[model samples]
Target chain A: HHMTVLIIGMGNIGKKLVELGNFEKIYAYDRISKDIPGVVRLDEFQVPSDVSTVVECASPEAVKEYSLQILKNPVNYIIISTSAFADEVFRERFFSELKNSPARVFFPSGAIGGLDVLSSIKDFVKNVRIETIKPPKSLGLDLKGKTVVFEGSVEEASKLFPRNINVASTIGLIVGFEKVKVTIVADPAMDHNIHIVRISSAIGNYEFKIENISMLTVYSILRTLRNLESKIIFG
Target chain B: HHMTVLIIGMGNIGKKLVELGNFEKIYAYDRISKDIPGVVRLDEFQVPSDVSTVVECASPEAVKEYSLQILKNPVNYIIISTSAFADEVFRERFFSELKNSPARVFFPSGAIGGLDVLSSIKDFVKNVRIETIKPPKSLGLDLKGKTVVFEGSVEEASKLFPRNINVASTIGLIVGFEKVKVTIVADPAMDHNIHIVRISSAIGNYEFKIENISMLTVYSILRTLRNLESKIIFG
Candidate 1:
């Protein structure tokens, strides 16, 4: 119950984190200030000495910018902006620093599921492909039919749509970045945000189609916090 | 890093748990005695006082018998025998007792995945179904061709094939027991164990199919323990 936390980026997701309160205390470090009570707002890059975990709900740019400083300490970090890992240069530095630090990083199964199995059979994975289908409106494309918005490697997709395609990056982390193929489709007929992941491995074959209303912002944080408190953490 | 554990049962799965060593100490409790070194063998109903976590890799009978005593204490319990919850009386009492206890019960994904999404959308779920395809030999069936082994609700499937259908029970805990439909198919032609999970909700529709070589034994414990130790806990 004495789990203290520092939240980066006081956006809608950060505000939601505060709403689901049970932590001993929550400290926020953001460019913008808020008037929320019972939460201590910290200065930029100044992690609380007492905080046990630092939750990164900020943009990938923020994660790329402050991850080293954050991980330099012993505090654990739970990342929601997983697309940051797609950056080749940033990831190398991040993990390199991680080697010497006591801190650890955690990824919540954002919009997709079945990552547990994907991670388990990582070494054996022959091919891993992900197709994310969203309503044209959701992707800001006012189209009449299903259209291929983006098709590339996870690395390229992350560069193209950092916020929109973190799911690809998440998959890339499990199954090597080189092996992950990404497809972003804008379907006018589709109503919800959907991610279809097909993985081929020596162990077996897996097809996971996770359809959700929107990109993972609130639900991702909610799931991670629940598991953190839960006696049994489900994947 | 100094994590002590209690492992119930001395079966192949339990023995495998001991083999994958990293814990500070491992205490074994079962009906029969084992000759494994560095494992303190305890009598039935007796729990190790020093262990922080109690891992149930035993049968449903073991779970039904010892769950209360194990939970009555403050130690966390990781259950591989999820089918035990299928019993009406046992589940009622187990959950009722869990409400007041500090100890929490954790269900390993076992041989399935996407439970993270199911647990997140508990209230919003409209329909959830699971189809398990296994070799006839795995289910102890001698029949030829692809045959429908069992078809019913998750609660019923748990009772009909207790050891074979822990995935159904895991799904039932996430989505309510009544909402989960399970279909078990025994295919003589199949080479691997396969589970397909489909969930329909207000948010979206999710389909997860996980294939594996065998049931949840070594793999399940290995994954959970790895996540516990890893700095980056994916999924």
Candidate 2:
């Protein structure tokens, strides 16, 4: 079966999804219109009837704006901009509104993996931390040596670097925000992104050391679309 | 919204699931019923129309026996005994027969995690390996220090010890059997089971080091059940 969905962003990632993603039909939604290939503009005035899923690669503002409307109908809403969840009021509001809806919201493992265990043993998990080590060039900084640029709570980090903390936001949502810690490092010696997720729990200890040098988040979105229609699923 | 299911197997793990699982009803199937609590006996004569899911903790024999009948109806089948997948013919048969079924099959992260990446970059994954290290007592042997008990393909390890290689079988099913490697280690100094999963792909390099001291497989099943009814999901 072919996937038909409404993509809620027209930025770099959203345009990439349209060009590369295998889809039968796509309805594009954005604050501004752009003549993108393989998509039709969806207006805010009308409710999308044919689209079965909504792919959100837009800003966290877009998530807050369209979430309630998206929840009104029973569609698979996959959110890539989970940084909105870092907000205390918005998170609670979404949960409260979701009680009356029939939609299924998915937070794909876009930047990181191994979420199955985190969700399962969440009650017993004592602490969760994601330390991202990146090259100075990647962080748009000119540094001489290794430096701990920022080390704080999830909320603070999300505000400081909205794009960088989606992984932390994803983790905080799973195991709660209280147990989540964020660390960002800019090392001149590094060439790629290194994410070290250390999860300490009552049952066990887990560490997912990921060395990424490619476009992984987009692939994760594709995986999410595949799992929607697949008879056999993993993760 | 409560979980109702037919659990195939009455062994130690199955019994634990019934006792710990948050369920409204449970129908159990076993070769020899030994009076497990919180469950009713399910024979092969009748079809289960009320159950929404089937939890299989039974042996590979039970999986091979009841799979076709379970697939007759549209129920989520969560297989804990994935060692059956190591067989070439049975794996192919299950795929061929699954084409006509409405049932969804799930291979939970019972003994390991980090399946999200394995499923996403599956086509680009060059190799996958799982090294399980256990104490001598856990493996029914008396050893002095660290020793490599077995090192070979997924099939050989599954054939030698069914219980020891569920994690390996699960990985094979995700990324195909040709690129899978299994290693078993027996160490007398260890007190818990340690699972190290390594994946090499064209996009990234991933490693998950897990130290399990609790009954996590049952928790994974519970998480699966919760996700089935949850409005918002993680992993």
Candidate 3:
């Protein structure tokens, strides 16, 4: 039988993914494909819904609703709208339901790195520290020099900068415990959003500073809709 | 005391780590340290054979022989060499040794991704597939052009490219009894060693591609040589 991957976003990364056509088969969903030619707006169609995989790339609110439904159908799900992770209570509920069914949540190494390291050292995660550095433009804010826009634990980073700190939240999900010290550095000297991670425990000490996210396509429309005039383009 | 990280080996990724000091403290360890003069080469004299955390950066042989001694001191250890993971008996021995001390074996992300998903999904891992692709130079072999360097189960991949596929062995460590499929490619067009991982079962299908690593500095070298690489590489 042929395979099909039901992708839920037709935005930047999704469009690129379909262009690549690496999946055996792919179907994309978006809210308004009306203005965009050849794109399928999800609202128009009724799917058989027996999907093996459901990839959610909508907004945070959209992902929150659809992701749970996707899991309800017990279908495998890939969520690129990582902003939804800001809600720890909501995320906890979803994983708990996942235990009842085969449905699972998967987080890619989006616009950031060190997920592998974070995953590997869970057994040894005595503490985790993260600092996200970006040009104010990346955060949809304008500031001068290096600004510590946000400081606190991972939970707070997600709550304050849901869309901006999806990577931070995603990382917080893996290290098992909370208290991931997160700092946001808005630096004009930086070209892109840089993620600096440090881990310490009985196992050993490891640190990584991820400079410049190479693949960041989800924020284009948001940037446009927010009428953001900054030229701090997505990488 | 301030934190630091040290990474052994000056190969492709190792040399790059030397060039980029990504942490508060970083160091490098290599047989030929003179080439990277500013970085300290790990020697018995300067490296402190008795300090905590000694990362094995030499080679497969070095990892097999020296790592045991590092574990003996109760300093705990983090290792990146998969070559020594071929023997299941050794794993049994390793785990047994860990039982006695407060230390357990620690593995790095190396060149793969999806570790978080893999660990979380271990309870339902029906099958695991790992494909490792590298340029000819990364192979540490005299072969040319693109070809399959490793094609077998996870256990065998550990035997084949132990050092190169440390992450695969890492997956094996996490997956235990679940079946693992592994493939290795030597591509001439590749710039870095690429890790493509796929996992499937009743739970869901997950995939990831990881490439690129940061450089280390003098402080990183101190951490790596002393078995404190975990502390500096992660938080």
Q: Whole-model Cα lDDT per candidate?
A: 0.78, 0.85, 0.56
**What DockQ number belongs to candidate 3?**
0.05
TM-score ranking, best first:
2, 1, 3
Q: What is the DockQ of each candidate?
A: 0.54, 0.81, 0.05
TM-score of chain B of 2: 0.93
Native contacts retained, all candidates in order: 0.66, 0.87, 0.06
Q: Which of 1 and 3 is the better model by TM-score?
A: 1
State the interface C-alpha RMSD of candidate 1: 2.1
Model 2 DockQ class: high
**Model 2: how far is B150 from its true place, Å?**
1.4
Which lDDT tens digits does candidate 3 get at residues A1-235? 2335677766766675556434455556677544543334455433335555665665677676665556666454556566576676778776776776556555655554445555554655787777777777876777667888778876666677765666666666766537477787888887755566666754445554444322333322222211112211110
Please, what are the lDDT tens digits per residue for candidate 2 over residues B1-235?
3868888888877888888877788888887857657788876633478988998898887778778888887899899788888988988888788899889998888868898878888898999888988889987999877999999999999888866678888899989988999988999999988999999999899999999873778888778877777877787
Model 2 residue B157 lDDT score: 91
Per-model TM against the reference? 0.86, 0.94, 0.48
Q: Candidate 1, A72: how far from true, in Å? A: 3.5
Docking class of predicted structure 3:
incorrect
- Candidate 2 TM-score restricted to chain A: 0.94
